[PDB]
């Protein structure tokens, strides 16, 4: 099977240079070309350009010389694509995809890897403020409010898991360089408030883990 | 550089429905042109490249033909598993370039907004900020417009709008707005309110929180 692996998300900072990496297995490495691919969130796919680790032969996007530089390292079968001068604009998830049909080629993309997500930012490791939504019917539904955090993910959960029907958590926004997102939760208005509800909130890369009981206002 | 456009950037279906997407070059691309097929968690395949050839493990229900300018990709019996985007990309002439994407979605019957809003918590009075919160649960179909008003008076400064993918249960949309102000500002005013334009209804859909209530 061929396969292709991509290192993990970075967060960079602005100005800075990242190199991410592109782990070919199942097929001879070097005689095929590697491309890299753009997809910033909102928008479909623009190609970097390409290299062929059998003799480093490159080819660049006119948009991307100067920005990104390919290499290719033979003995481990592994792509780099090094990103320049790093801006808002580059914030985006970067595949890297083999040709099909060698050298000679066919501009058709047989196998992907699994993108890598670039995110640049000036912000550096926060954690959440979480909010609790009550409102002041058969069903009735609360939220709560994850605010102000860096970076990417949270995960939010209601009662441990057990409401799992009837909950949305919304993707996050950006905004003044931290994300906040929402999460709402319907239950039956004969169990709220008699019983309790509470968002669990965490935030791996802060190592927090937030429960917060939603109560009624008055 | 090639332009390609792919005739909607949406599109409804019905499982077991035959569905078409389409696209179409700036100029010839000889046959030159592959379908991908991306899913929500970001991975990426190739279903077919030379306008038609199918690779090599991807089901035969999907289908590819065209010349010139002018292709389509066909899956001639919608799955679940097919939901998904779908990319076409010319390989005529360098740069390949891309068109902008079909993303497929489960048709089902029109559906209003539950429209929910939240007043900031004291926790976050403290802090000297206010966000005040409105869920639009459950809609169909997914466009949806939201408007804010403080003591009737429409605000659109402050406010942030996220969006869910269709539910994979029930085939409907969801959004959140937020409204951030000022603690200031915030305990200046009384009603807030949101209210959500949407096909199912033709007056506005209104949900209001009141500081004196």
């Known amino acids: 099977a061929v396969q292709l692996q991509e290192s993990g998300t970075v967060l960079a900072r602005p100005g800075a240079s990242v190199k991410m990496s592109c782990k070919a297995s199942?097929?001879?490495?070097?005689?095929?070309?590697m491309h890299w691919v753009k997809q910033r969130p909102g928008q479909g796919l623009e190609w970097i350009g390409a290299?062929?680790?059998?003799?480093?032969?490159?080819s660049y996007n006119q948009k991307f010389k100067g920005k990104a530089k390919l290499t290719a390292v033979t003995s481990t079968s592994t792509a780099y694509m090094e990103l320049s001068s790093l801006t808002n604009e580059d914030s985006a998830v970067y595949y890297c995809?083999?040709?099909?049909?060698?050298?000679?080629?066919?501009?058709?993309?047989?196998?992907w890897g699994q993108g890598t997500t670039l995110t640049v930012s000036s912000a550096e490791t926060t954690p959440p403020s979480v909010y609790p939504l009550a409102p002041g019917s058969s069903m009735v539904t609360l939220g709560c409010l994850v605010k102000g955090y860096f970076p990417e993910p949270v995960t939010v959960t209601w009662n441990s898991g057990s409401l799992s029907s009837g909950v949305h958590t919304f993707p996050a926004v950006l905004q003044s360089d931290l994300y906040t997102l929402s999460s709402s939760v319907t239950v039956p208005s004969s169990t709220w408030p008699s019983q309790t509800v509470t968002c669990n909130v965490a935030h791996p890369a802060s190592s927090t883990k937030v429960d917060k009981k939603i109560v009624p206002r008055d | 550089d090639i332009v390609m456009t792919q005739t909607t950037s949406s599109l409804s279906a019905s499982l077991g429905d035959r569905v078409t997407i389409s696209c179409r070059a700036s100029?010839?691309?000889?046959?030159?042109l592959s379908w991908y097929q991306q899913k929500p968690d970001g991975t990426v395949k190739v279903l077919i490249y030379?306008?038609?050839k199918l690779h090599s493990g991807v089901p035969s229900r999907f289908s590819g033909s065209g010349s010139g300018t002018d292709y389509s990709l066909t899956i001639s019996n919608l799955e679940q598993e097919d939901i998904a985007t779908y990319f076409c990309?010319?390989?005529?002439?360098?740069?390949?370039?891309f068109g902008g994407g079909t993303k497929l979605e489960i048709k089902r019957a029109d559906a209003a907004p539950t429209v929910s809003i939240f007043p900031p918590s004291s926790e976050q009075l403290t802090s000297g900020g206010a966000s005040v919160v409105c869920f639009l649960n459950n809609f169909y179909p997914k466009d949806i417009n939201v408007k804010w008003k403080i003591d009737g008076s429409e605000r659109q400064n402050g406010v942030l709008n996220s969006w869910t993918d269709q539910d994979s249960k029930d085939s409907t949309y969801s959004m959140s707005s937020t409204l951030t102000l000022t603690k200031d500002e915030y305990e200046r005013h009384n009603s807030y309110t949101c209210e959500a334009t949407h096909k199912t209804s033709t007056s506005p859909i209104v949900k209001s929180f009141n500081r004196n209530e």
């Open positions: 990309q010319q390989g005529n002439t360098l740069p390949p370039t």
């Open positions: 100029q010839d691309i000889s046959n030159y």
């Open positions: 290299i062929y680790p059998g003799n480093s032969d490159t």
């Open positions: 199942g097929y001879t490495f070097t005689s095929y070309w």
């Open positions: 995809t083999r040709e099909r049909g060698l050298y000679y080629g066919s501009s058709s993309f047989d196998y």
């Open positions: 030379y306008t038609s």
